[PDB]
Design a protein around this motif. Structure first.
Motif, PDB file in Angstrom:
ATOM      1  N   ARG A 255       0.844  -1.227   0.000  1.00 45.39           N
ATOM      2  CA  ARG A 255       0.000   0.000   0.000  1.00 45.39           C
ATOM      3  C   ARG A 255       0.870   1.265   0.000  1.00 45.39           C
ATOM      4  N   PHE A 256       1.918   1.309   0.829  1.00 49.90           N
ATOM      5  CA  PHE A 256       2.746   2.528   1.020  1.00 49.90           C
ATOM      6  C   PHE A 256       4.041   2.404   0.199  1.00 49.90           C
ATOM      7  N   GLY A 257       4.143   1.342  -0.600  1.00 55.66           N
ATOM      8  CA  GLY A 257       5.252   1.113  -1.544  1.00 55.66           C
ATOM      9  C   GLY A 257       6.597   0.913  -0.860  1.00 55.66           C
ATOM     10  N   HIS A 258       6.640   0.214   0.277  1.00 50.12           N
ATOM     11  CA  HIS A 258       7.891  -0.085   1.029  1.00 50.12           C
ATOM     12  C   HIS A 258       8.587  -1.285   0.375  1.00 50.12           C
ATOM     13  N   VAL A 259       9.311  -1.054  -0.713  1.00 53.87           N
ATOM     14  CA  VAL A 259       9.751  -2.145  -1.639  1.00 53.87           C
ATOM     15  C   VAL A 259      10.881  -2.970  -0.986  1.00 53.87           C
ATOM     16  N   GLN A 260      11.784  -2.322  -0.258  1.00 53.55           N
ATOM     17  CA  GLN A 260      12.838  -3.037   0.501  1.00 53.55           C
ATOM     18  C   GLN A 260      12.172  -4.011   1.482  1.00 53.55           C
ATOM     19  N   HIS A 261      11.176  -3.547   2.249  1.00 53.01           N
ATOM     20  CA  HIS A 261      10.436  -4.365   3.256  1.00 53.01           C
ATOM     21  C   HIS A 261       9.742  -5.549   2.572  1.00 53.01           C
TER      22      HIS A 261
END
Ligand SMILES: Nc1nc2c(ncn2[C@@H]2O[C@H](COP(=O)(O)OP(=O)(O)NP(=O)(O)O)[C@@H](O)[C@H]2O)c(=O)[nH]1
Ligand SMILES: Nc1nc2c(ncn2[C@@H]2O[C@H](COP(=O)(O)OP(=O)(O)NP(=O)(O)O)[C@@H](O)[C@H]2O)c(=O)[nH]1
Lengths: 359, 168, 169
Positions: A255-261
């Motif tokens: 949703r918040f685009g935390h791609v590393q996570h």
């Protein structure tokens, strides 16, 4: 539980005794939930209450860890029914006890505020002295709502302070007024040093908050630096924690685009095809909120794009309805040749043995 | 007024740390194996005609928590390092523990005893008494014992010896 | 003045409202949800006949009964409240056997005791007449009788107050 046994649990603070069925194979948190549900909400700061093993025949008193299994603490056979206590998580002192009045002074509002200010200003050596005197570090600043350990987790290079507080009898699982633990607080601040030390000091990375959300789940909400997320997953942190609407860690990351996570979570076993109440997978959320970079990662790592939620929408169709036409092109354009399975197996620390048997 | 002695029992999983400590404090040997998270025992004994309060910390062989393990080491006045005669692995592990205690304490001399447990199981024995004594000599001629929690051999001597060393 | 301890026991068949009665008395809360009781202990300070009393209330199990617990609680109990549901005939029928068991264990014809007809708020569902309760109570050496509603807070306090009076006598 199926293998559940009957345990007599006394709440001294309510002067009540409750015989309950508790699952030895289930974790301590499960058993604690059953006690609180039985209490009819009678406790104030209920989350900082914990089941307690009474002292017996030399053996010291201690609190059950919420993230350990109930059967890891064997019951005493002195009573006909095994007896556990529900108590507020105050410091466990040694048999030898300090002056009754000398305590009342140390724990005045003013003295406690002064002590918190020492932790805030990172005065380690002064903090140690007050703990040696017998101050109980398990309390809340009224305005701030933070226990000393939660404050220490915020400070950089706090390892010195964290060790001193844990030695001074602070509980690792002590929650703040809002229900977060020091482990939750370290992860929110992205303080790798604080988190590693808490884990090093016997802390579990799976401590639950008021809503049952884990520090790993908090990191996926917060994004930013992904070091703490990896450290929790490295510590065999638990996966597939879900909120009231059934969102998992990848759902919040997408949703918040935390791609590393997202990448860390996928790598350590995250079920890509897992769906929330709506039936939406991570790729559905990726389409809904126009996270093209997160979408690519899922597609790249073998995520099924034909999955349809309870409105019978594919991620492609969700994107179209949302207006993200470029993102829908990426999803339709993607082919099975583009998928890359993960190269190698993930690495874990040897900090603690895994709950449950090994043959 | 009684002198307090803070003792720690360290070793690898299954060596008999809990069984030794529980035999000493409660005079019971348990066949059943329950891994130890953490346990504290307090017992009053008479050593060199003086009343002593022993606080014994029973550690986890299986878990490692470096911050906690260093905190046990910082607080402990005396340390009993337990190995199984039956299990070679447990004997091998002890060398690193020695050096860790000395590093944390920041002194070459710390009250300590090397304990070879499960001495009753001679048939299963994989570690020689000479190996233990040879290792003990390497450790600045550290105290060495072979003990059985089951057969009540040298259980009392382990804790008595630690108190003697702390007193000196 | 010296606070006297009173050990009271609430026994009945499942679902009569033993837990709801006890919790209404001690916590002043009525719980709609039904959770069967293994065995639950409440302590409350109250003023009866201008004296401060410490009540220890044992809330027993109607269903999934344990013999060793039952044998213990009858021997230790100073006073007993036998609860039945006005709505459920079966619960009323079962009480006769409980009374004889208490008298057998106590080894005396006189034991502080009260017959309680719970769920008196549900008149529409009523299957047991007040006269039936009173008639049974008379049979039991003119034992005390009450109709009570945990939900509506009717005669909840009187049940425990009556037991304390009887123990005093
Ligand atoms: N024959 C014999 N058995 C022993 C002896 N000491 C321990 N045992 C057995 O070995 C097993 C392990 O004992 P235990 O005290 O739990 O070892 P531990 O050091 O506490 N292990 P952990 O680090 O998990 O706590 C038990 O089944 C016990 O019966 C001993 O001296 N002799
Ligand atoms: N309307 C109404 N409902 C009541 C009353 N007393 C009890 N109930 C209901 O009856 C159900 C059974 O309540 P409970 O007190 O647990 O029964 P019990 O005697 O404890 N049974 P057990 O032997 O298993 O413990 C609950 O849903 C409760 O809300 C009452 O006075 N009025």
């Amino acid at each position: 539980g199926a293998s559940a046994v009957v345990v007599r649990v006394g709440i001294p603070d309510l002067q009540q005794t409750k015989c309950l069925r508790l699952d030895p194979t289930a974790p301590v948190w499960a058993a604690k939930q059953r006690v609180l549900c039985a209490l009819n909400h009678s406790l104030q700061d209920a989350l900082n209450y914990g089941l307690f093993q009474p002292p017996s025949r030399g053996r010291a008193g201690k609190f059950l860890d919420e993230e350990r299994l109930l059967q890891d603490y064997p019951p005493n056979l002195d009573t006909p029914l095994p007896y556990l206590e529900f108590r507020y998580k105050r410091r466990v002192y040694a048999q030898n006890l300090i002056d009754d009045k000398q305590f009342a002074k140390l724990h005045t509002k003013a003295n406690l505020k002064k002590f918190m200010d020492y932790v805030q200003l990172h005065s380690t050596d002064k903090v140690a002295r007050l703990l040696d005197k017998g101050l109980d570090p398990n309390f809340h600043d009224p305005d701030s709502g933070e226990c000393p350990l939660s404050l220490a987790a915020q400070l950089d290079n706090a390892t010195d302070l964290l060790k001193v507080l844990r030695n001074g009898g602070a509980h690792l699982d002590f929650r703040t007024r809002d229900g977060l633990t020091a482990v939750h607080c370290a992860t929110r601040q992205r303080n790798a040093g604080a988190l590693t030390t808490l884990l090093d000091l016997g802390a579990s990375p799976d401590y639950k908050d008021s809503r049952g959300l884990t520090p790993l789940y908090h990191s996926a909400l917060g994004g930013g630096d992904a070091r703490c997320c990896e450290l929790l997953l490295h510590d065999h942190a638990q996966l597939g924690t879900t909120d009231e609407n059934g969102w998992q860690e990848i759902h919040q990351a997408c949703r918040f685009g935390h791609v590393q996570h997202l990448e860390h979570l996928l790598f350590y076993g995250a079920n890509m095809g897992a769906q929330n109440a709506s039936g939406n997978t991570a790729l559905h959320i990726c389409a809904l909120y126009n996270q093209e970079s997160c979408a690519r990662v899922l597609l790249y790592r073998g995520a099924n794009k034909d999955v349809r939620n309870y409105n019978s929408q594919t991620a492609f169709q969700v994107a179209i309805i949302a207006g993200n036409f470029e993102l829908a092109e990426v999803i339709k354009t993607h082919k099975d040749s583009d998928v890359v399975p993960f190269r190698e197996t993930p690495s874990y620390a040897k900090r603690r043995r895994l709950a449950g048997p090994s043959g | 007024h009684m002198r307090e002695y803070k003792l720690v029992v360290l070793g690898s999983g299954g060596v008999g740390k809990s069984a030794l400590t529980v035999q000493f404090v409660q005079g019971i040997f348990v066949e059943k194996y329950d891994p130890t998270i953490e346990d504290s025992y307090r017992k009053q004994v008479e050593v060199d005609a003086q009343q002593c309060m022993l606080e014994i910390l029973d550690t986890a062989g299986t878990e490692q928590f470096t911050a906690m393990r260093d905190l046990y080491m910082k607080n402990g006045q005396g340390f009993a390092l337990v190995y199984s005669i039956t299990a070679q692995s447990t004997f091998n592990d002890l060398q690193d523990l020695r050096e860790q205690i000395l590093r944390v304490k920041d002194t070459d001399d710390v009250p300590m005893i090397l304990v070879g447990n499960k001495c009753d199981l001679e048939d299963e024995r994989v570690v020689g008494k000479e190996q233990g004594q040879n290792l003990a000599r390497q450790w600045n001629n550290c105290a060495f014992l072979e003990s059985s929690a089951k057969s009540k051999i040298n259980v009392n001597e382990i804790f008595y010896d630690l108190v003697r060393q702390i007193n000196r």
